[PDB]
Ligand binder design. Structure first.
Ligand SMILES: [Ca+2]
Length: 456
């Protein structure tokens, strides 16, 4: 139990956490999608070693080469896509394809690229629709795609571009990029948006937005905005339409979803349903200050930086206002000026924490762009909370049901793959004082924290 001497104490700490988490995966869920830390068991979503693949690049970046080699062997011998299983196009793309692509780039091991190309081909049947807008699910073994148990969600079909574009770039096979870019282009000219803000669903037959008039930056839409900017960055900042749509969208957020709480005036993003504003902010929305800061770094308006800094503070508060120091799934703010009234309110139904990375993810970007060490300090505090309230003695960490009860957080007995793929990776990078480590200038992270090279 020892780590490299050159590591500053905070990265060192992240590694200790990763090791305790991995200890659980190896002992009770090796080769399985997710670990059930409490019951020392495991769960299967796709049956593709999800946690392992999602953690490949994180292990490499943390210098856990021994563990990486071991995981590599499993991919080499146990990973088989010749399976009769339905997978979500979006979910499998960001974790499996994205994870394999990053692993390939960091290790230089062709195995990961071979698996990526295999997986990518099995996903293509999803685009066989009248509109070319892909179905939500696709059976990687039978080759048949189909809608949800309905239309497809907008964020899902517009948050797979980074991965598909890179696969085409590496293989020379243009079908991946062309299919994915068709979607992006179709969305670009689609009416039904509200100043850049997009609806949550789109019909695969008509190719039109559905559930019109309802807008959120949380689930079903969050990554759409994220990928407009990241694709532009990935392509060497030459695709102006992407930039324009992004800039328009941020203005749309300002004009329609941005409000301030009372009495502290915390800047937050709410939801809009047919003209009615809802002061409801899912933790998922905390990806925004990071994306905003990332844009500023690449030449976007300084107003984006002000907004970034304000939302980072709010996100930080969503975490720190809780008794465990961990943000709940959803937070309701107050617009009603009332003396004794606070700003943050959480409904008993939304007090869970699934070990989400959104806050630490944005801390990473805010730090890289501003250089303010307070963002590192904030991340260290959140890590402490994960260690104190989610740690499972036998190994691993678990999502919890009550973020407001430090005496009884109530483990849900589940470690999501993104805890190791995203949360611990962003924290490790946040604590790095080397701006050249996965520089914002040379790499762009997909929505599951898998770095991809910026095209030259
Ligand atoms: Ca994400």
């Amino acid at each position: 139990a020892q780590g490299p001497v050159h590591l500053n104490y905070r990265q060192k700490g992240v590694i200790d956490v990763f090791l305790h988490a991995w200890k659980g995966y190896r002992k009770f869920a090796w080769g399985h999608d997710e670990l059930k830390p409490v019951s020392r068991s495991f769960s299967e979503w796709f049956g593709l070693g999800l946690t392992l693949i999602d953690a490949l690049d994180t292990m490499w970046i943390l210098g856990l080469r021994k563990e990486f080699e071991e995981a590599r062997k499993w991919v080499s011998k146990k990973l088989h896509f010749e399976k009769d299983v339905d997978v979500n196009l979006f979910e499998s793309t960001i974790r499996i394809l994205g994870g394999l692509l990053s692993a390939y780039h960091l290790s230089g091991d062709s195995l990961f690229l071979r698996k990526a190309e295999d997986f990518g081909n099995r996903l293509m049947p999803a685009f066989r629709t009248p509109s070319k807008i892909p179905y939500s699910d696709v059976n990687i073994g039978t080759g048949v795609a189909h809608p949800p148990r309905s239309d497809s969600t907008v964020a899902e079909v517009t948050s797979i571009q980074l991965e598909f574009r890179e696969l085409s770039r590496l293989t020379g096979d243009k079908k991946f990029q062309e299919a994915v870019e068709k979607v992006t282009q179709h969305i670009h000219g689609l009416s039904g948006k509200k100043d850049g803000l997009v609806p949550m669903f789109i019909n695969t037959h008509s190719g039109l937005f559905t559930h019109l008039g309802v807008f959120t930056l949380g689930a079903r839409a969050d990554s759409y905005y994220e990928y407009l900017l990241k694709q532009w960055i990935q392509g060497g900042k030459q695709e102006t339409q992407l930039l324009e749509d992004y800039v328009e969208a941020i203005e749309g957020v300002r004009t329609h979803l941005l409000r301030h709480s009372e009495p502290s005036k915390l800047t937050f993003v709410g939801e809009l349903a047919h003209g009615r504003f809802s002061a409801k902010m899912d933790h998922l929305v905390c990806f925004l200050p990071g994306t905003l800061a990332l844009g500023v770094y690449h030449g976007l308006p300084a107003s984006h930086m002000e907004l970034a800094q304000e939302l980072m503070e709010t996100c930080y508060q969503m975490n720190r206002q809780m008794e465990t120091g961990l943000s709940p799934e959803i937070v309701h703010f107050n617009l009603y000026p009332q003396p004794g009234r606070r700003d943050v309110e959480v409904k008993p139904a939304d007090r869970h924490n699934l070990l989400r990375p959104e806050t630490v993810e944005s801390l990473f970007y805010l730090y890289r762009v501003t250089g303010d060490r307070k963002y590192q300090d904030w991340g260290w505090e959140i890590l402490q909370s994960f260690s104190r309230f989610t740690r499972v003695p036998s190994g691993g960490y678990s999502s919890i049901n009550n973020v407001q009860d430090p005496q009884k957080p109530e483990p849900r007995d589940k470690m999501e793959s993104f805890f190791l793929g995203e949360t611990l990776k962003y924290l490790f990078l946040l604590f790095s004082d080397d701006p050249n480590l996965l520089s914002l200038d040379a790499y762009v992270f997909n929505t599951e924290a898998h770095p991809l090279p910026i095209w030259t």
